Design a protein around this ligand. Structure first.
Ligand SMILES: *[C@@H]1O[C@H](CO)[C@@H](O[C@@H]2O[C@H](CO)[C@@H](O[C@@H]3O[C@H](CO)[C@@H](O)[C@H](O)[C@@H]3O)[C@H](O)[C@H]2NC(C)=O)[C@H](O)[C@H]1NC(C)=O
Ligand SMILES: C#CC[C@H](CP(=O)(O)[C@@H]([NH3+])CCc1ccccc1)C(=O)N[C@@H](Cc1ccccc1)C([NH3+])=O
Ligand SMILES: *[C@@H]1O[C@H](CO)[C@@H](O[C@@H]2O[C@H](CO)[C@@H](O)[C@H](O)[C@H]2NC(C)=O)[C@H](O)[C@H]1NC(C)=O
Ligand SMILES: *[C@@H]1O[C@H](CO)[C@@H](O)[C@H](O)[C@H]1NC(C)=O
Ligand SMILES: *[C@@H]1O[C@H](CO)[C@@H](O)[C@H](O)[C@H]1NC(C)=O
Ligand code: NA
Ligand code: NA
Ligand code: NA
Ligand SMILES: [Zn+2]
Length: 855
């Protein structure tokens, strides 16, 4: 009667070998039935079998061993998400048993488990499909199982369905059998050995398009019938990228087919289920007339990410979620490795360092965590899907690859994948594989087992270049790293290398130089400070001959300058003085970096009684970029980088009431409205045009009236953004209510809408209030620890900068007890607000005076 197992982790001594899964789902009553048969063996004689089960009603369980069979008593521990099957006789070690479980459940109304998705046909008919999302811990909501990623097994899946529905799963359909009136049973081929979280199945009326790889794999894209004509780009990209990975690793994709399914309701961007990868419609479907350049880039990179997982994640899987980065850091990194070859015109390698700066935002906080760090419950496991695992993980891999050389790195990765195929790995296994080709292990332990990153301080005395490292933290630790430093000088644009393994060291230049610049191309996961006249020298370089260093080296100097303000190593005035070089900048990365450093400053001011300085700061920003803004054409011409730069600059200028852009935007919007929304605008100007049009009641209502009928993910995204920019608080309240409800705007959009309104200069109180009042339902929908909940917490609170706002945040989240008070995103936003308070207290008046002098 008392539950015989009191640990969250399963026993290690009962091991599954093979699952037979029968699923019978009813898309009218929104219920399903299942029969799960799992072949198991026991290392220790045990009479209790413990496995995972969550929100399933177990009707019967039996144990099979001359084909004997006997009943098992069923106990449940809902908190541990486990059931116990008690046998009459102890199991015999080494002998194969089969556990048979019959159960029922309800389709989930969330975005995980076996869940309901809906869409409307062009005439307004509601259609229902059922889809799966199991990673990390939701397979147990669809079938009882040993639901930890190291208990790999093969899966034979059978789906019972109505004739009107199509079923697809991980493997090809090998047989369909009519089993009763109006009931067909689909048999799918057995999977290779894999983790439970990769099982997938979808029952829908999707259509598809297909293409065969040179290696014979059938690649298909599935989508709702009204959107299948948008699948062509992703289909071509998936074939090219699958071919790339197969040839790059020389490890073939092992399955006969690869499906890419666009799901109408989906929480993350995509999911790598082996043989059946799934996507938000916005991450897969491309409209040649309406999709933006950034949306095309996003599809390319998301497909690259999911296909990378077929090797990094599916073939080779981390042993436990503490090492999730072995899946996610690699897949994030592989997006850039692959697409830089398959789509050279996208020039994605130029964009990579930006992920590293994103990671450094959270990693500079005490509340960050090491790349590899212990987790136990599902909320903590979901918290591992964060910028540390993804962005820092990819960034330290890039750093290691540059240090070892690409060929040595690749040889280590190939050996790693071959050795651990169909098995599970830990941090140490990766370092051992890399070393089999230098003390990689000691070096990479410093980057994976402690949080944060170092500040490298450079002091030059003639030819003598002194170096110091210290942990960078916004206001003891003693952390030290093995830092692979790089530098160039005024006399040498060769990349020079120095391994700093101690707190201090020195190198001797062959001849004196006029400047030196560390972290070449921003490939290292560290920041740099220059003592003495260093920042003056580099500021003079940027203002005199900025092309003396690369565009990404310029972006790195902009970013680091403002990071040093936060720790008192550089004054805000000197960092702002450096940003003035941007009046002659032309390139997207340093322009975007300037925006990423300066916009957050007025976002803080917007939430304070600071209208005068806020206005003057925004005027400074427009004046700084005015020549570049004025040069933009109102077209879709040019490269992907030119298109994204154009769109962001025109949006920025219009949001800040730069009259030349506002007048042009108003005229386009009036014409678009007069055409009854049938006018083809340049996609690259549509954000600015819609954002301006939405400022009036009539323009907002008209924009919303066209949202219903759009089949374009970009158009829907552009309308959502514009509607969230209104200063009409009643309209902002409506957007929150309706996207929360999910009928007129899908709930998958709510996290973004909440964040957009949290950034609205008049809406931010509404967003914070809405989060507090509707917390419990939002958690039920998206789950504690999810990235969705983290971004809603940060997006409504992390631009506050007063003690009163800080106490609201602390008071609210501490009141949640077990329903959120321990979230890592809460500690992070609290620490961010604390930094914001100190930063504004110190620098606000300095910025005010600097702007007055800037005249
Ligand atoms: C999900 O549940 C619904 C509702 O219970 C099932 O719909 C029902 O399906 C049965 C079997 O096809 C229908 O009865 C049959 O009707 C045909 C004539 O259409 C007749 O020839 C048969 O002898 C039998 O009477 C029943 O009308 C239908 N009900 C509704 C409201 O549509 C559905 O089959 C279930 N689907 C799955 C996959 O379990
Ligand atoms: C590119 C890409 C695909 C990646 C999801 P994935 O292929 O890594 C899958 N393995 C996550 C499973 C999963 C799903 C839900 C909860 C936990 C885990 C993605 O969507 N990235 C988002 C950020 C993000 C990351 C994780 C979760 C939400 C959002 C982006 N816009 O960058
Ligand atoms: C699926 O939902 C149904 C409700 O539609 C649940 O059935 C209820 O179960 C409770 C507890 O035994 C009963 O008191 C109710 O009378 C049941 N309702 C109906 C309409 O029969 C069912 O438990 C849910 N299944 C799971 C696995 O959670
Ligand atoms: C980080 O937080 C822990 C626990 O709250 C505390 O003990 C430690 O001193 C903090 N470190 C810094 C550098 O503030
Ligand atoms: C305008 O309407 C016509 C006719 O319905 C349609 O074919 C065309 O694609 C529409 N164009 C836009 C930009 O909506
Ligand atoms: Na998801
Ligand atoms: Na999420
Ligand atoms: Na969190
Ligand atoms: Zn991933």
């Amino acid at each position: 009667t008392p539950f015989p197992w009191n640990k969250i982790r399963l026993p290690e001594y009962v091991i599954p070998v093979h699952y037979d899964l029968l699923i019978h789902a009813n898309l009218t009553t929104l219920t399903f039935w299942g029969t799960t048969k799992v072949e198991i063996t026991a290392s220790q004689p045990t009479s209790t079998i413990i496995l995972h089960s969550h929100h399933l009603q177990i009707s019967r369980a039996t144990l099979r061993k001359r084909l004997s069979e006997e009943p098992l008593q069923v106990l449940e521990h809902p908190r541990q998400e486990q059931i116990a099957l008690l046998a009459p006789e102890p199991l015999l070690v080494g002998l194969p048993y089969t556990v048979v479980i019959h159960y029922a459940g309800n389709l989930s109304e969330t975005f995980h488990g076996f869940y309901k998705s809906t869409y409307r046909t062009k005439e307004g008919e509601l259609r229902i499909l059922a889809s799966t999302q199991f990673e990390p811990t939701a397979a147990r909501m669809a079938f009882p199982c040993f639901d930890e990623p190291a208990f790999k097994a093969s899966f034979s899946i059978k789906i019972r369905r109505e004739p009107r529905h199509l079923a697809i799963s991980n493997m090809p359909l090998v047989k369909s059998v009519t089993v009763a009136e109006g009931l067909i049973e689909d048999h799918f081929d057995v999977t290779v050995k894999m983790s439970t979280y990769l099982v997938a199945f979808i029952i829908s009326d999707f259509e598809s398009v297909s293409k065969i790889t040179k290696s014979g794999v059938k690649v298909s894209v599935y989508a709702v019938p009204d959107k299948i004509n948008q699948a062509d780009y992703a289909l071509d990209a998936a074939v090219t990228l699958l071919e790339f990975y197969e040839d790059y690793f020389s490890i073939p994709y092992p399955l006969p087919k690869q499906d890419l399914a666009a799901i109408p309701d989906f929480q993350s961007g995509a999911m790598e289920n082996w043989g059946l990868t799934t996507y938000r419609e916005s991450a897969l479907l491309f409209d040649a007339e309406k999709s933006s350049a950034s949306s095309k880039l996003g599809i390319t990179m998301t497909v690259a990410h999911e296909l990378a997982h077929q090797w990094f994640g599916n073939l080779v899987t981390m042993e436990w979620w503490n090492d999730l980065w072995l899946n996610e850091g690699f897949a994030k990194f592989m997006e850039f490795v692959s697409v830089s070859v398959t789509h050279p015109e996208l020039k994605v390698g130029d964009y990579f360092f930006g992920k590293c700066f994103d990671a450094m935002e959270v990693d500079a906080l005490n509340s960050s965590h090491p790349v590899s760090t212990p987790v136990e419950n599902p909320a903590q496991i979901r918290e591992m899907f964060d910028d540390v695992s993804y962005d820092k993980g990819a960034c330290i891999l890039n750093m290691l690859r540059e240090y070892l050389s690409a060929d040595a790195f690749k040889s280590g990765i190939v050996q790693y994948l071959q050795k651990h195929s169909y098995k599970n790995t830990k941090n140490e296994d990766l370092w051992d594989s890399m070393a089999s080709i230098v003390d990689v292990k000691t070096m990479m332990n410093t980057w994976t087992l402690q949080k944060g990153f170092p500040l490298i301080t450079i002091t030059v005395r003639g030819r003598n270049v002194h170096m110091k490292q210290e942990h960078y933290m916004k206001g003891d630790t003693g952390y030290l790293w093995h830092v692979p430093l790089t530098f160039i000088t005024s006399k040498s644009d060769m990349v020079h290398r120095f391994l700093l393994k101690t707190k201090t060291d020195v190198l001797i230049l062959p001849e004196e130089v006029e400047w030196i610049k560390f972290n070449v191309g921003m490939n290292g996961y560290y920041i740099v400070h220059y003592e003495d006249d260093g920042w003056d020298s580099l500021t003079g370089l940027l203002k005199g001959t900025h092309t003396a260093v690369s565009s990404n080296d310029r972006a790195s100097l902009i970013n680091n300058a403002f990071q040093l303000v936060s720790i008192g190593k550089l004054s805000i005035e000197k960092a702002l003085d450096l940003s003035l070089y941007l009046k002659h900048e032309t390139e997207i990365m340093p322009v975007f970096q300037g925006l990423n450093e300066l916009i957050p400053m007025y976002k803080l001011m917007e939430k304070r009684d600071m209208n005068e300085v806020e206005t003057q700061f925004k005027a400074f920003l427009i004046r700084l970029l005015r020549d570049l803004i004025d040069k933009q054409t109102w077209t879709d011409e040019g490269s992907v980088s030119e298109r994204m730069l154009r769109s962001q600059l025109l949006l920025l200028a219009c949001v800040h009431n730069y009259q030349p852009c506002v007048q042009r935007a108003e005229g386009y919007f009036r014409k678009w409205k007069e055409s009854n929304g049938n006018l083809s605008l340049p996609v690259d100007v549509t954000l600015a045009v819609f954002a301006v049009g939405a400022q009036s009641t009539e323009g907002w209502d008209f924009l919303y009236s066209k949202y219903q009928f759009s089949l374009s993910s970009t158009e829907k995204s552009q309308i959502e953004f514009a509607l969230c920019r209104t200063q009409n608080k009643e309209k902002l309240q409506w957007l929150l209510d309706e996207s929360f409800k999910g009928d007129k705007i899908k709930t998958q959009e709510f996290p973004q809408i909440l964040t957009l309104i949290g950034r609205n200069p008049v809406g931010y109180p509404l967003a914070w209030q809405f989060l507090r009042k509707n917390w419990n339902k939002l958690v039920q929908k998206f789950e504690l620890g999810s990235s969705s909940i983290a971004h809603m917490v940060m997006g409504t609170t992390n631009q506050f900068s007063t003690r009163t706002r800080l106490e609201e945040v602390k008071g609210f989240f501490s009141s949640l007890k077990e329903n959120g008070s321990q979230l890592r995103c809460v500690q992070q936003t609290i620490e961010t607000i604390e930094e914001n308070i100190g930063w504004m207290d110190k620098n606000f008046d300095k910025i005010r005076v600097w702007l007055q002098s800037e005249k």
